Ligand binder design. Sequence first.
Ligand SMILES: [Co+2]
Ligand SMILES: [Co+2]
Ligand SMILES: [Co+2]
Ligand SMILES: [Co+2]
Lengths: 48, 48
Amino acid sequence: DYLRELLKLELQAIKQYREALEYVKLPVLAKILEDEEKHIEWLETILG
Amino acid sequence: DYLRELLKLELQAIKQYREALEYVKLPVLAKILEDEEKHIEWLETILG
Ligand SMILES: [Co+2]
Ligand SMILES: [Co+2]
Ligand SMILES: [Co+2]
Ligand SMILES: [Co+2]
């Protein structure tokens, strides 16, 4: 469970950034996205 | 505001990982922390 709990925060975050980038086009914002994507994979991985 | 909204998700996340690492000592988990820390700084920065 704890890990699934990280999973959902991570997915809720990648939504807020996703929306933010739907309007303002900042590179830094989008650099954060790819950090969470990398993240998200590592989560499911060890989730199994 | 939107940016402050990212700020709080990011800070709430670094709490869940912080706690998780308070019990299980996975390197990957801690690699995520430092991604969010890097993140957090970029947020406040552009927050001003
Ligand atoms: Co919308
Ligand atoms: Co993340
Ligand atoms: Co506690
Ligand atoms: Co982050």
